[PDB]
């Protein structure tokens, strides 16, 4: 199927590898991306554990909240990394790494 990745609003930062692959974006995760990933996951796990005490299900609510937070944090980190690679976010380190490549 025909696809187009061009955006209506042009990128305001240098663009490297305009259409990155999933594996390449995942391999571009920085320390900040892991920090926000872990923060979202931990917040979700804590909320699930605290909310499930009254019904009597701590473990099940913990796992449900953990799944929700895992998915949300992973997609947030992927969004940030893809934007950095594609030039929509400040890619201070991406251009430094890929200029020497």
């Amino acid at each position: 199927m025909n696809t187009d990745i061009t955006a209506l609003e042009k990128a305001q930062y240098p663009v490297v590898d305009r259409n990155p692959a999933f594996t390449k974006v995942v391999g571009n995760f920085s320390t900040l991306d892991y920090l926000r990933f872990s923060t979202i996951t931990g917040i979700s796990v804590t909320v699930g554990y605290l909310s499930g005490i009254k019904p009597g299900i701590k473990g099940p609510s913990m796992v449900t909240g953990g799944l929700i937070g895992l998915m949300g944090g992973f997609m947030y980190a992927y969004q940030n990394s893809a934007g950095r690679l594609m030039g929509f976010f400040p890619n201070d380190g991406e251009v430094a790494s890929y200029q020497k490549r």
Binding site: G42, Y49, K58
Partner: peptide, 30 residues
């Protein structure tokens, strides 16, 4: 009696500590 027995509650404590540390790092690293 120097052992916390509830495994589920221990994981919640670890997750809360991780969330706090990650939030602090997020506010510092960015």
């Amino acid at each position: 009696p120097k052992v916390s027995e509830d495994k589920n509650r221990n994981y919640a404590v670890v997750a809360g500590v991780v969330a706090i540390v990650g939030s602090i790092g997020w506010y510092l690293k960015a």
